[PDB]
Write a protein that binds this ligand. Sequence first.
Ligand SMILES: *[C@@H]1O[C@H](CO)[C@@H](O[C@@H]2O[C@H](CO)[C@@H](O)[C@H](O)[C@H]2NC(C)=O)[C@H](O)[C@H]1NC(C)=O
Ligand SMILES: *[C@@H]1O[C@H](CO)[C@@H](O[C@@H]2O[C@H](CO)[C@@H](O)[C@H](O)[C@H]2NC(C)=O)[C@H](O)[C@H]1NC(C)=O
Ligand SMILES: *[C@@H]1O[C@H](CO)[C@@H](O[C@@H]2O[C@H](CO)[C@@H](O)[C@H](O)[C@H]2NC(C)=O)[C@H](O)[C@H]1NC(C)=O
Ligand SMILES: *[C@@H]1O[C@H](CO)[C@@H](O[C@@H]2O[C@H](CO)[C@@H](O)[C@H](O)[C@H]2NC(C)=O)[C@H](O)[C@H]1NC(C)=O
Ligand SMILES: *[C@@H]1O[C@H](CO)[C@@H](O)[C@H](O)[C@H]1NC(C)=O
Ligand SMILES: *[C@@H]1O[C@H](CO)[C@@H](O)[C@H](O)[C@H]1NC(C)=O
Ligand SMILES: *[C@@H]1O[C@H](CO)[C@@H](O)[C@H](O)[C@H]1NC(C)=O
Lengths: 47, 117, 49, 119
Amino acid sequence: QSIIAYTMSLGAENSVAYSNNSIAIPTNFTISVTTEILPVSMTKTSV
Amino acid sequence: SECVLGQSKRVDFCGKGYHLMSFPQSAPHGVVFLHVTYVPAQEKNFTTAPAICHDGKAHFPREGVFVSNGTHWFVTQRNFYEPQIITTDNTFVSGNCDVVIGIVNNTVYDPLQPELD
Amino acid sequence: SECVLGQSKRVDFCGKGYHLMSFPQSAPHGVVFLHVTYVPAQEKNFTTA
Amino acid sequence: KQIYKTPPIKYFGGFNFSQILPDPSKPSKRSPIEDLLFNKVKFNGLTVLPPLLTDEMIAQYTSALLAGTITSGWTFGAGPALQIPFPMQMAYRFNGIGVTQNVLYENQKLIANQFNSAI
Ligand SMILES: *[C@@H]1O[C@H](CO)[C@@H](O[C@@H]2O[C@H](CO)[C@@H](O)[C@H](O)[C@H]2NC(C)=O)[C@H](O)[C@H]1NC(C)=O
Ligand SMILES: *[C@@H]1O[C@H](CO)[C@@H](O[C@@H]2O[C@H](CO)[C@@H](O)[C@H](O)[C@H]2NC(C)=O)[C@H](O)[C@H]1NC(C)=O
Ligand SMILES: *[C@@H]1O[C@H](CO)[C@@H](O[C@@H]2O[C@H](CO)[C@@H](O)[C@H](O)[C@H]2NC(C)=O)[C@H](O)[C@H]1NC(C)=O
Ligand SMILES: *[C@@H]1O[C@H](CO)[C@@H](O[C@@H]2O[C@H](CO)[C@@H](O)[C@H](O)[C@H]2NC(C)=O)[C@H](O)[C@H]1NC(C)=O
Ligand SMILES: *[C@@H]1O[C@H](CO)[C@@H](O)[C@H](O)[C@H]1NC(C)=O
Ligand SMILES: *[C@@H]1O[C@H](CO)[C@@H](O)[C@H](O)[C@H]1NC(C)=O
Ligand SMILES: *[C@@H]1O[C@H](CO)[C@@H](O)[C@H](O)[C@H]1NC(C)=O
């Protein structure tokens, strides 16, 4: 609806609830799967 | 070699999270890695202390951290919340309660005496 | 990833000594790593078995 | 992912990190050491293009990494940031290299004071 321009944002802001006698420990977990792709070869050419 | 034929401790080398395992797939002129990772979830906050005093001696955890649920203190492992009672088989002794900053009073239970009534 | 977001056991990858922690700093067109290491000192000799 | 901030107090069991955290009394919000680091370093159809990221934006990535680490260690890189007191963070780090964790807890002041001079 219009090419708008803006100053990109670096990400959601978040404060860690730090104190001198507080800790946070997980009580559950998930198993994640992610992909990574890597090239290994090109076509062999001859002139 | 390092992601498929073994388990790596290298951060972000084998996916995002704690590396468990990886499976290769063939792609044209390339390779695809399926990275299986461990991700913790659903944290709760607790009060903690580095050591516990009992009989005038400082007790430190063998592995884990001391936590408090509001009224009682427990030992937990660092990666999953699973509390156990603080005993003499869970901890070791080193030094006196005069050098540790933030040490707290609690009871460390000895299994020997209630067996001997 | 390996020096700042975790603790490495790779020798000489994160400074000289036993790696404890690292702090990044920004430089123009580059990065500076402040490597914090553990270095033992003042050895004595003993007999062992 | 997120831009972390340190708490106002800025007192982590002694350890003094003021030389690596941003200086609030500056337009650039650089650290004291970053200010030194940047103080040492058109033609006939030729042009130089500007970077996509300004150096203010890069400083914000660095302060987020510093605030994450000092408050949650390495947990925020694998999931949610989990707070733990910093003195306890240092004790785990000695354990990872084969040193028993009472060496820090009984000598916390010595290690913090020696660190502060070494940095
Ligand atoms: C940990 O998380 C899983 C979900 O990711 C929980 O399992 C679900 O539990 C609800 C009941 O609370 C069930 O209705 C769902 O069917 C469960 N999901 C699966 C996939 O089995 C699990 O209970 C959580 N653990 C704790 C202690 O809260
Ligand atoms: C902290 O956990 C303890 C243990 O679950 C709770 O204390 C009670 O402990 C007695 C044994 O000494 C049990 O018989 C009760 O069932 C426990 N009560 C509950 C509600 O679990 C204690 O309540 C917990 N503290 C807080 C603040 O939740
Ligand atoms: C933890 O328990 C110890 C032992 O009971 C406490 O040490 C006592 O401290 C009081 C002062 O608070 C002194 O009058 C006693 O002489 C001490 N007893 C001994 C045997 O030395 C210690 O104060 C307790 N800590 C806290 C925070 O209450
Ligand atoms: C952290 O260290 C800085 C120095 O690197 C301290 O700031 C200096 O403190 C001395 C007194 O100890 C003053 O004379 C200097 O003028 C201070 N420098 C600046 C730039 O203000 C700072 O106080 C230390 N922080 C803590 C909590 O000890
Ligand atoms: C733990 O407490 C802090 C405030 O001290 C809060 O910001 C944070 O959200 C709490 N964490 C959880 C899981 O409730
Ligand atoms: C933590 O800091 C508060 C002040 O913010 C202080 O009252 C408390 O005693 C401190 N805890 C420790 C263990 O030093
Ligand atoms: C240990 O003894 C050897 C000789 O056997 C000596 O050369 C060395 O300097 C001694 N180390 C210390 C710390 O004294």
